[PDB]
Ligand SMILES: O=c1ccn([C@H]2C[C@H](O)[C@@H](COP(=O)(O)O)O2)c(=O)[nH]1
């Protein structure tokens with residue numbers, strides 16, 4: 210209903226009423242189109258307690274997006290291998306849109322249209338805007354990527370002071386990806402809400418085709434067997450007025466008492 | 472679960488009850504992250520609670536599909552919805568004084584057919600075709616999560632006379648059924664929200680026609696979903712009105728090309744909305 214129980218029954222949606230569809234690997238998936246969720250960013254943070262979610266990959270991948278560097282090796286230095294040059298990925302699109310790409314050894318600042326900042330600039334000036342958006346979809350660059358963004362874009366909305374984010378994710382797996390990126394885009398709200406000096410209202414998670422791999426069924430069926438435990442509430446120690454100034458040590462996650470994974 | 476126009480009205484209701492007031496001097500009631508499903512199987516989601524302009528919906532898509540950014544072409548057919556923005560009083564107000572009558576900017580139809588083109592004339596072969604790439608892909612790989620048409624081009628956004636309100640859609644194919652989900656950043660429950668529902672549900676009806684598919688659903692996802700404070704009193708009398716059965720959209724001509732589509736290829740069986748007030 211209100212919480213992780215949205216997601217947790219999104220599995221019981223696709224494991225029951227889910228439709229047979231095929232995966233780009235060629236493995237079978239159970240699919241569903243057009244889901245939606247609302248996760249509460251006030252008083253708490255939505256990190257999955259049903260299965261332990263990788264937190265510091267969630268944190269380091271983001272700051273890697275805020276940097277604008279598309280590379281494996283930079284994040285592999287954090288002992289994070291989840292990702293040479295991936296091409297013009299989110300990190301590029303966020304900070305530079307419509308800028309000619311060579312590789313990430315080239316400096317892409319000064320160029321494109323920086324979305325992340327243009328969202329920030331617009332929040333402190335225009336109290337109300339529906340046009341504040343970060344788009345990861347550029348069909349010209351896309352063929353140059355190692356993979357099209359599963360997260361097409363986000364949009365920000367402010368009412369009575371509290372910031373809300375909706376992220377449109379065209380495709381996600383319930384076992385691996387969406388739990389990860391739930392934290393990921395709920396993480397960005399906290400950040401931009403911080404700079405703009407606003408609060409955290411809600412995170413709306415919108416999914417296109419949402420599947421479950423036919424391996425992950427029983428694994429997912431073990432997970433739902435577990436009563437979810439109370440979400441964490443996140444704190445930001447150092448108050449930062451720049452977006453590229455955020456790093457790991459400014460983050461303290463309290464209240465994570467997940468279950469043994471897999 | 473609702474799945475109907477009953478949902479749309481439930482949004483209006485949940486907006487009107489719980490709406491938060493955001494003043495632009497014209498304030499509205501606003502909520503965020505609304506999603507509604509509209510069944511496209513054996514009915515057309517044309518809203519019956521109040522009459523939607525049909526020939527406008529039909530003529531805009533063709534105007535979208537062929538890539539037309541020119542509003543004069545809709546007016547010659549006496550569809551005037553877009554002719555305000557191509558009106559000289561509007562273009563010279565906003566700094567478009569160098570742009571001529573009917574010139575809107577790169578907009579949906581342009582971004583659809585040519586993405587990353589350079590707006591001026593004849594753009595054929597220029598930019599990326601978002602529409603023809605989806606129909607080609609549905610033929611080749613009906614299972615893909617990568618089929619999307621996005622109108623957002625922040626580089627070209629300032630060129631646009633108005634930024635795209637429906638910023639992109641996605642297509643999904645299963646059971647020989649073609650579906651669609653449009654993300655709308657902003658929509659007005661009283662005027663334009665029901666209007667797009669027709670345009671995209673028609674495109675799905677079109678694309679399913681070209682690809683040889685059926686129509687599963689149209690999922691309408693809204694960004695800020697708002698009611699201007701002045702539509703309220705007039706709106707709530709549309710609340711007590713109970714929506715009727717959806718009409719029957721059909722295509723009497725088998726059309727192998729999406730540019731070959733004409734206003735004369737459809738017939739609506741069973742559409743009878745409520746009178747005004
Ligand atoms: O945050 C993420 C990132 C990636 N994926 C996976 C799901 C799909 O298997 C795949 C997308 O590949 P395509 O369907 O676009 O080919 O990425 C997720 O589920 N969540």
Ligand SMILES: O=c1ccn([C@H]2C[C@H](O)[C@@H](COP(=O)(O)O)O2)c(=O)[nH]1
Pocket residue numbers: 338339340634636637657658659660662663664666667
């Ligand atoms: O399909 C549409 C097209 C336009 N609008 C109206 C609503 C807003 O008043 C305005 C967009 O406002 P901004 O996003 O530019 O702030 O267009 C809609 O509601 N639905």
